Design a protein around this motif. Structure first.
Motif, short mmCIF file in Angstrom:
data_model
loop_
_atom_site.label_atom_id
_atom_site.label_comp_id
_atom_site.label_asym_id
_atom_site.label_seq_id
_atom_site.Cartn_x
_atom_site.Cartn_y
_atom_site.Cartn_z
N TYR A 114 30.01 -33.76 3.86
CA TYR A 114 29.60 -34.11 5.21
C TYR A 114 29.34 -35.59 5.40
O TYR A 114 29.11 -36.02 6.54
N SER A 115 29.38 -36.39 4.34
CA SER A 115 29.24 -37.83 4.48
C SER A 115 30.34 -38.45 5.33
O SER A 115 30.21 -39.61 5.73
N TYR A 139 29.09 -39.75 8.77
CA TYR A 139 28.20 -40.89 8.90
C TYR A 139 28.80 -41.99 9.77
O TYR A 139 28.06 -42.71 10.45
N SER A 196 26.01 -39.06 15.16
CA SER A 196 24.59 -39.37 15.10
C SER A 196 23.83 -38.22 15.74
O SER A 196 23.85 -38.06 16.96
N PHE A 197 23.17 -37.42 14.91
CA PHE A 197 22.51 -36.21 15.37
C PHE A 197 21.07 -36.48 15.73
O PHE A 197 20.36 -37.21 15.04
N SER A 198 20.63 -35.87 16.83
CA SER A 198 19.26 -35.99 17.30
C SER A 198 18.36 -34.94 16.66
O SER A 198 17.20 -35.23 16.37
N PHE A 241 18.35 -32.00 13.48
CA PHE A 241 18.96 -31.34 12.33
C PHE A 241 17.86 -30.67 11.53
O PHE A 241 16.94 -31.35 11.06
N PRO A 284 17.54 -29.85 2.29
CA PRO A 284 18.73 -30.66 2.53
C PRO A 284 19.22 -31.44 1.32
O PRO A 284 20.43 -31.66 1.19
N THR A 285 18.33 -31.86 0.44
CA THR A 285 18.71 -32.57 -0.76
C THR A 285 19.45 -31.71 -1.77
O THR A 285 19.81 -32.23 -2.83
#
Ligand SMILES: CCCCC/C=C\C/C=C\CCCCCCCC(=O)O
Ligand SMILES: *[C@@H]1O[C@H](CO)[C@@H](O)[C@H](O)[C@H]1NC(C)=O
Lengths: 49, 48
Positions: A26-27, A30, A34-36, A38, A45-46
């Motif tokens: 998903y990188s 980038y 730009s998500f508001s 998530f 997420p890590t």
């Protein structure tokens, strides 16, 4: 085809799509997206990588 | 009513939609390559 589409659907007739046989890197989002909001729920997420 | 020991202030500018990334976890463009907080963080985050 999912994030950078042309027309979306109405919330009363929301759309659903299957995803299979693919690598989830998903990188590539980038540079453009730009998500508001998530939020992930049953997973951290890590660890999505 | 407290007294603090080793106070450091870090400063920078970012974009609005990235402010949610200044937190202990929170993968993303800002947290992966630019600025990361630890898991055992004691302090405060301020943004305006
Ligand atoms: C197009 C459907 C792809 C299927 C993905 C399935 C599992 C992976 C889950 C979440 C990754 C989605 C991208 C997260 C948003 C990018 C921000 C980031 O975290 O850097
Ligand atoms: C969609 O096309 C490319 C794909 O990444 C993207 O860079 C561009 O900003 C998008 N254009 C739209 C629909 O605004």
């Amino acid at each position: 085809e999912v994030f950078n589409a042309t027309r979306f659907a109405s919330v009363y007739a929301w759309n659903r799509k299957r995803i299979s046989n693919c690598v989830a890197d998903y990188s590539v989002l980038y540079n453009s997206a730009s998500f508001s909001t998530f939020k992930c729920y049953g997973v951290s997420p890590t660890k999505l990588n | 009513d407290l007294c603090f020991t080793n106070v450091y202030a870090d400063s920078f500018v970012i974009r609005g939609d990235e402010v949610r990334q200044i937190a202990p976890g929170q993968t993303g463009k800002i947290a992966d390559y630019n600025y990361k907080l630890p898991d055992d963080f004691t302090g405060c985050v301020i943004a305006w």
